[PDB]
Design an enzyme around this catalytic site. Structure first.
Site, PDB file in Angstrom:
ATOM      1  N   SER A 198       0.862  -1.182   0.000  1.00  0.00           N
ATOM      2  CA  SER A 198       0.000   0.000   0.000  1.00  0.00           C
ATOM      3  C   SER A 198       0.898   1.231   0.000  1.00  0.00           C
ATOM      4  O   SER A 198       1.661   1.399  -0.969  1.00  0.00           O
ATOM      5  CB  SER A 198      -0.981  -0.138   1.166  1.00  0.00           C
ATOM      6  OG  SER A 198      -2.126   0.647   0.951  1.00  0.00           O
ATOM      7  N   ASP A 247     -10.299  -5.184  -4.134  1.00  0.00           N
ATOM      8  CA  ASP A 247      -9.661  -4.084  -3.424  1.00  0.00           C
ATOM      9  C   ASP A 247     -10.388  -2.801  -3.794  1.00  0.00           C
ATOM     10  O   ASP A 247     -10.287  -2.337  -4.936  1.00  0.00           O
ATOM     11  CB  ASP A 247      -8.170  -4.017  -3.797  1.00  0.00           C
ATOM     12  CG  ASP A 247      -7.389  -2.986  -2.994  1.00  0.00           C
ATOM     13  OD1 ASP A 247      -8.003  -2.032  -2.465  1.00  0.00           O
ATOM     14  OD2 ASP A 247      -6.143  -3.130  -2.912  1.00  0.00           O
ATOM     15  N   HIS A 269      -8.073  -5.480   0.215  1.00  0.00           N
ATOM     16  CA  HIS A 269      -6.849  -4.702   0.045  1.00  0.00           C
ATOM     17  C   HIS A 269      -5.622  -5.435   0.587  1.00  0.00           C
ATOM     18  O   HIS A 269      -4.637  -5.628  -0.134  1.00  0.00           O
ATOM     19  CB  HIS A 269      -7.036  -3.351   0.730  1.00  0.00           C
ATOM     20  CG  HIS A 269      -5.858  -2.441   0.631  1.00  0.00           C
ATOM     21  ND1 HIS A 269      -5.325  -2.037  -0.575  1.00  0.00           N
ATOM     22  CD2 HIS A 269      -5.125  -1.831   1.592  1.00  0.00           C
ATOM     23  CE1 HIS A 269      -4.301  -1.231  -0.352  1.00  0.00           C
ATOM     24  NE2 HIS A 269      -4.155  -1.094   0.956  1.00  0.00           N
TER      25      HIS A 269
END
Length: 278
Positions: free
Chosen positions: A109, A225, A255
């Site tokens: 991320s 996601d 995610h």
């Protein structure tokens, strides 16, 4: 068995950066330098380091400035180079401690944005890259109003909130969400202008920085996601210079692929990809 040691270094601005070293009971096969994402910390990765350690890999994982056990104002950053400098310092520690080991940089991320940014800045300073849902196109994630706000305020008022985040999107396992929501060390607030600008720095220049990536690259991304649309990852593997690049899409995962129910398959894939490239 993989054993955790806790250490620290002086990051940029004299902020105290805490990091874990996970070392297995086998000859080291490679070092893994791991960058977590927005508002979390390295102890959300215990199981990833243990699975990497079972493959003989030594994992170094820092709490970014403003996160976890590290110092600095919570989720405060004024430039992407603050994160990449500290990442580079930890890469150097692992390089000096295990010379002769291949070097894997792994990021999820925001940490994926940090590792990509580090990677195009130092294309020759690691051997393998592994990105989980990397935040390399934040400009596609914020409104035009949020974008100008972050870009104009992120240096003078880097703690100003600009963007709400849907934490129920991090995983479809309620227990994972609940564990995030009850963690006293994670950020439960909004996305600040500082991190917003820093991620925009990465996203805006991704298409021409990426051809400078030559080392092998693995991208993981869940198709459901809704924090970072999988489309971003598809676009990234097209822009990277590396010939040895794969996007593994996991149908229906949210995610945090590493915390999802299928996490052991995701990690099996990562270990296989890495092992055969050492």
């Amino acid at each position: 068995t993989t054993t955790r040691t806790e250490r620290n270094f002086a990051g940029i601005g004299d902020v105290r950066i805490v990091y874990d070293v996970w070392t297995p009971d086998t000859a080291p096969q490679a070092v893994v330098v791991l960058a977590h994402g927005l508002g979390e910390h390295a102890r959300r990765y215990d199981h990833v380091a243990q699975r990497l350690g079972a493959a003989g890999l030594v994992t170094y994982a820092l709490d970014h400035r403003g996160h976890g056990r590290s110092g600095g104002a919570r989720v405060l950053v004024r430039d992407i180079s603050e994160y990449t400098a500290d990442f580079d310092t930890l890469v150097g520690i692992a390089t000096r401690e295990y010379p002769g080991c291949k070097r894997i940089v792994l990021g999820h991320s925001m940490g994926g944005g940090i590792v990509f940014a580090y990677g195009v800045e130092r294309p020759d300073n690691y051997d393998l890259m592994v990105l989980s849902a990397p935040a390399v196109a934040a400009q596609d994630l914020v409104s035009p109003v949020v974008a100008v706000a972050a870009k104009l305020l992120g240096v003078v008022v880097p703690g100003l909130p600009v963007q709400e985040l849907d934490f129920t999107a991090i995983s479809r396992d309620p227990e994972v969400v609940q564990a995030y929501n009850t963690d006293p060390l994670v950020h439960h607030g909004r996305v600040p202008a500082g991190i917003g600008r820093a991620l925009l720095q990465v996203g805006e220049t991704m298409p021409r920085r990426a051809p400078a990536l030559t080392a092998p690259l693995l991208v993981l991304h869940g198709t459901d996601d809704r924090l970072i649309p999988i489309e971003g990852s598809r676009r990234l593997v097209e822009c990277v210079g590396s010939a040895d690049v794969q996007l593994k899409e996991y149908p229906g995962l949210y995610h945090e692929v590493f915390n999802e129910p299928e996490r052991n398959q995701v990690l099996d894939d990562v270990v296989a990809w890495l092992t055969e490239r050492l």
